[PDB]
Design a protein around this nucleic acid. Structure first.
Ligand SMILES: [Mg+2]
Ligand SMILES: [Mg+2]
Ligand SMILES: [Os+3]
Ligand SMILES: [Os+3]
Length: 67
RNA sequence: GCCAGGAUGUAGGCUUAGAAGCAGCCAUCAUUUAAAGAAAGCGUAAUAGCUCACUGGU
């Protein structure tokens, strides 16, 4: 595996922790720039077809932690 | 009924000595799918294992 979506997103987002997500979003960050990048690096471990799918998943982990 | 799948990010986040689907608090997305819950029970110290939901076959 490579750094989990969580840590990748943490380091990306620029934080050391997650949240209570729906309520207190922990930070914002640029998708088409950043979420895509992570989607790229995480690809060897993603069962995704297109990068666009690879993304949907990453963005999906960002929600669970609120970003 | 019986046979076989029940999966990937991922041990979701947080918290917690541990907290991994299954103490508790937030959520509960998305992927690849014929289908397959951020899991409905049992199980574990935590893991693992087992079932269940859904799908195929007969
Ligand atoms: Mg299981
Ligand atoms: Mg899963
Ligand atoms: Os089995
Ligand atoms: Os689905």
């Amino acid at each position: 595996k490579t750094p989990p979506a969580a840590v990748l997103l943490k380091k990306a987002a620029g934080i050391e922790s997650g949240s209570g997500e729906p309520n207190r979003n922990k930070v914002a960050t640029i998708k088409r720039d950043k979420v895509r990048e992570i989607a790229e690096l995480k690809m060897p471990d993603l069962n995704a077809a297109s990068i666009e799918a690879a993304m949907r998943m990453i963005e999906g982990t960002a929600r669970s932690m609120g970003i």
